[model samples]
Target chain A: MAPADYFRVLVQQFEVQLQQYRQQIEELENHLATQANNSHITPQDLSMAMQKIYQTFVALAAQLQSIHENVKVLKEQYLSYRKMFL
Target chain B: MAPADYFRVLVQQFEVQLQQYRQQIEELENHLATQANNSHITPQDLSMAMQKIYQTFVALAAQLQSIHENVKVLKEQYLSYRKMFL
Candidate 1:
């Protein structure tokens, strides 16, 4: 494939990933907002929930970094292939 | 150039990302655990840390979703390519 093709493929992949990430972010926002409105929930409850969410987020960030690294490798390969083939 | 290859590639990518995610989760867990053990740290400090961690997690979750979506797209693409080429 050409360099353009590789770029297009990578962009497409990134877009799909971005879409999924947005969805997860939306869910977290919704949960936080809901919790904020709840009068019965104590500070401790909020703290605990926040801590759990944070833990999940940390894991998520790490995953994203890995994905990024993988993508970078693919991108480099694509570039090399384009250099050789096109 | 086969369905199995597609599955394997997707799983590999997922594992790579998962490893990164797990690292972040571990960090958060460590921080929380440390906070729990620390006598000098005020409740406010802990609370702030927890809240910040949760916010990051929310973003991370979204990013993870995006990675998953991209991988899914790649898997589909690989399957289609295999079907056509092999």
Candidate 2:
């Protein structure tokens, strides 16, 4: 794909991606709500379960930080191109 | 710990554990809100980032399921003791 087209697609689809992320988190929140109401559940012997989830999110945050950094660079490049188009 | 004591702790500390889970997810939601405002991102370059997060949740769900199963059995065992006391 051409650089111009790629840049345009990124800008165009960013909202859709955010929408999807919002939906994903909303679903997770709903599921947790169900778990919160469960009367006879929640495993104490399963302490490590939460730990694993926490680790995954920490790793995810690291990946997101890297993506944000790369985005800073990409957006800078796109700015010059955007000026030419504008 | 004795069986009775362990089961009691399991039931007692459950709320604390859930509080931690709630706080963690809340933090994630707030962080995502910040990401949502990011103009130059949402990563057409990082599409699979979302996919990775989703997979981690799937794995977390499986772990939670195993925990719930154990909790079910543990609750039943506790019930037997509860009846003896009451």
Docking category of candidate 1: incorrect
TM-score for each model: 0.34, 0.34
lDDT of 2 by residue, B6-65 (tens): 644554454444444445445545554555567443455345444544554565556555
Off by over 4 Å in 1: A52-63, A74-86, B1-86
Question: What's the count of clashing pairs in each model shown?
Answer: 5, 0
Taken over the whole model, the C-alpha lDDT of each candidate is 0.51, 0.53
Model 2 whole-model lDDT (C-alpha atoms):
0.53
- What residue pairs clash in candidate 1, if any at all? A17-B66, A21-B62, A21-B66, A54-B53, A57-B57
lDDT of 2 at B69: 64
Q: What residue runs in model 2 are displaced by over 4 Å at the alpha carbon? A: A1-45, B1-45, B55-59, B62-86
Worst 10 contiguous positions by lDDT, candidate 1 chain B: B39-48
